[PDB]
Amino acid sequence: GPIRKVLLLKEDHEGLGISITGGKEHGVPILISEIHPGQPADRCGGLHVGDAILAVNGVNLRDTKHKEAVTILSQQRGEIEFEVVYV
């Protein structure tokens, strides 16, 4: 399917406003499980539930364990670019 590059802006006192599930230990990609209303992902648009996050800010998430992805994602700030594909 199409790999979309999706932009999101957030202040440091904000979360991304997504939940993720999956990861290498589960044999599945890092998947968006929920988009929280009113938060940056929702307000900025372009992300959807069921999207696999292939990368964030150029950092490949394709073979990451759940906790690694949590770390990487949680450390991104300001203008953030996701590369996602709906599965």
Add this chain to the structure above:
Amino acid sequence: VQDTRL
């Protein structure tokens, strides 16, 4: 899996 809010 786990489910983590970010």
